Design a protein around this ligand. Structure first.
Ligand SMILES: Nc1ncnc2c1ncn2[C@@H]1O[C@H](COP(=O)(O)OP(=O)(O)O)[C@@H](O)[C@H]1O
Ligand SMILES: Nc1ncnc2c1ncn2[C@@H]1O[C@H](COP(=O)(O)OP(=O)(O)O)[C@@H](O)[C@H]1O
Ligand SMILES: Nc1ncnc2c1ncn2[C@@H]1O[C@H](COP(=O)(O)OP(=O)(O)O)[C@@H](O)[C@H]1O
Ligand SMILES: Nc1ncnc2c1ncn2[C@@H]1O[C@H](COP(=O)(O)OP(=O)(O)O)[C@@H](O)[C@H]1O
Ligand SMILES: Nc1ncnc2c1ncn2[C@@H]1O[C@H](COP(=O)(O)OP(=O)(O)O)[C@@H](O)[C@H]1O
Ligand SMILES: Nc1ncnc2c1ncn2[C@@H]1O[C@H](COP(=O)(O)OP(=O)(O)O)[C@@H](O)[C@H]1O
Lengths: 267, 267, 267, 267, 267, 267
């Protein structure tokens, strides 16, 4: 079968849109414009991309990005076989060859100008240089490049270069408003609505502590964790300590603050 | 036999719970949520994980984590044989393939975004990219990811990224209270109870010197060492100098302080 | 066929000259003088080079430049085949062998004295040392060296060395004046002229914020993106947020400023 | 014969105990506890370890530790033979396999978390992961781990991590008192007792200059050198300049001070 | 034919001596003393060396020096052939074997003690250690070592070590006086004498701005470029902007100054 | 023939002793004590070592030391042959095997704890671990280790570690007094005695400028260069500019000072 069939999103992933990012991604795709998704960790960027891959009926090749990621990781390599020499394409190369969506997750993790590899794939005529193979690929007309990164979570030297930034269209994601986020919790875990709202208020409290002892507030992912634990019958206070507090802080006082909020919420 | 049989915990490891971490780990596991254990060195984190692996009847694949650990160490490699080419899975890959617990011990030792390798293994659909093999593994439904690290014992640049932190549930371990720690000493070494309490008071004294000449107080492991030495008939003052003082400090005055405490305790 | 035929520019690329850079590039070429194109990102440097390659009827071998680019990337290598040993030329070497234009795009990305590789190709007698092959190439009489870089977008240590700088003739590009840039938008996307002017005023507003919260103003490339999106029926305010604002800033206040400008322009 | 026979200490090495380190090392060994020897250079740490290896009748595998020492140096590797593929164990692996004493000399030289390799060999169940071979070794019940390092002679970043420190029992060595050190000189070189005392007073003088122009005083090893030279008929003043002064300082004034002390001692 | 025949300077290169460097280089050569040429970029150092190689009738092996240049680049390597193993000499090794002039151009680019490779080739008995081949070469009696570098154009840490500096005799080149430099322009390009003088005054103006907004004034090479462009019929103001201004500065005000000088010179 | 015959010093090298370093080196050798030679560049350290190798009738294996020197350079390696696998010893290993003098020239160039490789070769029982070969060499009873370095010419971090320093006996060389240095010039070049004295006064003048604009004064080697040039009929002022001034300074004023001294000396 096709090497891309394993990258197909089979069952529809649940995604709750916050604003018009679905239709706008479809517009970007119809114009084959590269897409950049920005936001804090755990606000549904990858699940958004994955939902779009489902809706467009396109295979999704996701690459998790490194600090030790060289240009080499993405493109492909020469395998020395008993047969004696065969070439094997990398993820980005497969996507570029057969019109798949390539999703560079946490692109800004990689060293900045290790990431200038994607520039030829964003020119008006999109190409991919496999210079170790000696091949010049013309990118499949249906190929779509998507990148993701958490702004402020990386160095200014590790930040995306302007030359790279200005090759993309962009969406800025943030954690959903209280109602939408509660709805996500309820849909994902089946936890009671009012309980979901309570969890969300705890998250709101931590997120309000951003810049005041926390580098980042509580993500939606951790709320999902807390709800999942509760649904398995874990005591609410324990679940929230375990999922919402211990992961994000080592500071004893911030911990005390969050735990007090939790104990005020769940008596 | 199964390649995992060597990773089975055979005999029940002695673990003394401090609070409800056993049942809560079982809850995390039933939901297949990644688990993070935080605490100072020698407070029983690895033995906790190992006890859980025993109680769950799961094989335990432990990886000791490096500063020179690349993404490469974990996944696996191509072996050039006389036969001519065979692939061999790494530890994490074996665990991910056949539903074992993979325990990344001292995860925060590794360069931060060398550690973003585990992100795909924490998505709602858990996968493991062997891109040097060209294989996309779907993680075994019983696979469980556990990491451990000592907060404050590493650089802020070497610290776990928020993107990684917020993918885990968390337990914070600390050294046990006096009675429990004494009980651990007695169970592990057979040393007399009152002597165990005395050792624990020396440890309490050093741990009170944390931030005042010591980077970290005396761990439970060193107390176990001291008790073991005494049980072999080493003089108490010598045993305590040897196990509780010399390992943790080079400062002559801190050494004098700890040795005075010891000599006040063991006349 | 010739290994250079794939590097031929087939269809005439649309380029709008700002001043006399076409004829002056032709003069540099007739004298075989190396050419350096300087300017901010997205001001048509690569498309200029590409247009010249079309007009001169020369193949264009473009290399996108790295931070991890070693001297090795450019020249070529030894391939271990089942046959048993064959050499394969790199891009620069092919261009130097058969009189093609070699275009080092973002040359200043690479480590400075990794870039002193091109010095022998700029002597009065132009040579290319393949010292790993043991070959001394005399550069084809029609070979032309072109480099590109964004000044100020790189480190002073990463900057081009004087020894390298003073081996080139130079063009300084900037974003076109309002009318010319509008004309480019209209030609490239078919967007209405007055709308093109409006987009350009938004770009002017951002470019005026350079040094006051922005590292670089809005490039022509992003204006093209915005126009393309509008032409696909995206709402003007959404298109401009998506193409002109989100890519270039993470600052909430700069974002507010640009978005206010946009909403003042497109009611 | 056994691969360990070459690591046997054959003839009894002369070691002069300062306090009860012999019996205490025997106690640590009977409990299979890892041992750490701390002290300045040339105070007999390695000769102590070597004497214990002689007295215990154990082979001694000594590894001199690097700044460029990776985890790789210690464990072993795959050799590509004409035969076609054989594995060869490293020093630590041989020691761990067949119950030898492995002595990591100057362990703190190596990058700190390159040295966390020895953690599995210090767990209550001692194992050695050869993950490049795919083998999990259970450490021989008679295997004994000993490390050595000079405190203050290395960076705080290069210093032993607390996680590593708190896995060892510890001895702190210092240069012997005057009489014992003289006795060592006499035993090792056959130099006259009163002369040995004189040499020792010169060493005392330099060691008193520690922190006042010297990073470290004169070691016992250099005293041995001076005595050896004198015994070969070198003039005392020349011998002391050559062995006790020139090796430890480049400062002309410190040199003048030490040389004046020497000339006051040896007229 | 001889592997050195390709390194022969065939046609006499035009070199205009400034002072007695020809005869003095001949004296250094007759004594086989290593030669060091110092000066700013584009003042004819390489063409001087090349002229001497012509006049002495010696082949010239030139090596362009790197920041990524290891000791390895210079000496040679083992090639794995289908035949199965052959050795191939590097440039320096060929020169050292058969009495050629080896010219390390921009030697100070390389990491300082990567450059201590040439020390054995400067001893009274000149040798070249190929320790990867296992060969000790005795340098050909006619071998001559020449190095070149731009002082102040490199780091103080990247600067030549004193140990290396004090192994060479030395010439300090600077840009020629007005008349000589004009003469060079006229000889090289056939541009009119008075025009050549005008170009030289522009260069004088920029070179006077050294330390006042310019890191280095206009080199002779760029003057040659300007003259060449003019000779091809490029407008004088355009030629001078293109060759003398754009290459050496990104500062808008320095650019304005130089352009004003040019427009004052060429009305 | 013996692999060491090429390392034999055949003809007696001219060395002028300054004090009793010959007999003292013979004493160190009779006791097999490692020797360290310290001094500025060009004061005859290597020629001293070479003279001792001649007088002792020992082969001399000299290694020039790197900043990129790893532990690997010294010991040896595995060669993949058509035959299929042979081992080849490195320089240090050959010397250690067959009782040659191994001379690590500029040892302090190498990274400090890359240089702790020589520690086992300085123990009372001298061994050499070839752990990549799996061999433990017992050093030949006639093996002699000599190192050389220029104090102050390297970083404090690049400086020799105390652990390494205190394993050697030591000689401190400085440039000879006026008469002896003149005598060296006369013997080496045949230049007239009074002229030799004049050259030496110029060197004295520069050496007096040490710390006042010069990092190091004029070495004896450069004086030899100047004398050699004069003997070939180079004008004294030109010879001294060329050999004594241009190599050691880029400062125009220091240059003026030295040149004035020269012109005062040689009218
Ligand atoms: N808009 C959303 N719709 C559905 N689920 C969401 C949404 N936002 C966040 N989530 C939840 O957050 C968790 C992590 O989402 P993910 O896509 O990994 O975030 P990111 O990729 O931005 O870190 C998922 O379990 C997902 O259910
Ligand atoms: N809760 C506990 N129960 C039993 N033993 C403990 C406990 N805490 C610490 N120890 C003892 O401490 C020593 C080291 O424990 P370990 O699991 O290696 O700590 P960590 O992994 O946190 O460094 C072991 O010998 C163990 O017996
Ligand atoms: N002078 C111009 N003529 C035509 N198109 C231009 C011009 N300047 C910029 N563009 C547009 O800008 C976009 C990016 O141009 P590009 O050549 O990649 O810029 P650079 O290489 O300087 O980053 C292209 O889509 C191109 O249409
Ligand atoms: N206690 C001791 N007994 C015998 N010899 C000693 C003693 N202490 C130091 N020495 C001498 O010091 C020299 C170096 O000792 P070594 O074991 O290499 O010290 P370290 O390993 O601590 O640097 C040896 O020649 C040894 O004879
Ligand atoms: N003395 C000279 N005689 C002839 N040409 C010169 C002289 N000095 C500089 N040039 C010109 O300068 C240009 C670059 O010279 P080059 O030898 O590359 O300088 P460098 O090697 O010092 O950078 C050449 O085109 C050459 O014609
Ligand atoms: N004592 C000496 N006897 C003879 N020649 C000397 C003496 N000192 C210096 N030289 C001369 O100095 C030059 C360089 O000497 P060298 O041994 O390379 O110095 P170093 O190795 O200390 O840099 C040689 O040409 C040598 O003739």
């Amino acid at each position: 079968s096709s090497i891309l069939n394993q990258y197909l999103v089979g069952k529809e992933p649940f995604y709750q849109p916050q604003h018009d990012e679905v239709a706008l991604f479809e517009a970007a795709y119809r114009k084959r414009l590269p897409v950049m998704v920005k936001g804090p960790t755990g606000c549904g960027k990858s699940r958004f991309v994955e939902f779009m891959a489902w809706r467009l009926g396109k295979p999704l090749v996701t690459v998790a990005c490194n600090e030790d990621m060289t240009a080499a990781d993405l493109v492909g390599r020469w395998l020395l076989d008993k047969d004696g020499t065969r070439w094997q394409d990398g993820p980005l190369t497969v996507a570029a060859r057969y019109g798949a969506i390539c999703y560079l997750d946490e692109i800004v993790e990689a060293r900045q100008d290790t990431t200038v590899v994607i520039h030829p794939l964003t020119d008006h005529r999109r190409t991919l240089p496999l210079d170790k193979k000696g091949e010049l690929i013309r990118a499949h007309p249906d190929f779509q490049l998507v990148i993701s990164y958490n702004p402020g979570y990386q160095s200014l030297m590790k930040d995306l270069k302007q030359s790279t930034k200005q090759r993309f269209t962009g969406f800025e994601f943030d954690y959903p408003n209280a109602e939408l986020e509660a709805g996500i919790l309820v849909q994902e875990t089946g936890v009671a609505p009012s309980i979901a709202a309570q969890l969300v208020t705890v998250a709101a409290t931590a997120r309000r502590l951003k810049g005041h002892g926390l580098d980042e507030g509580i993500s939606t992912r951790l709320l999902v964790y807390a709800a999942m634990l509760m649904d398995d019958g874990v005591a609410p206070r324990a679940a929230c300590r375990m999922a919402l507090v211990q992961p994000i802080t080592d500071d004893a006082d911030i911990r005390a603050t969050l735990e007090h909020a939790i104990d005020m919420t769940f008596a």
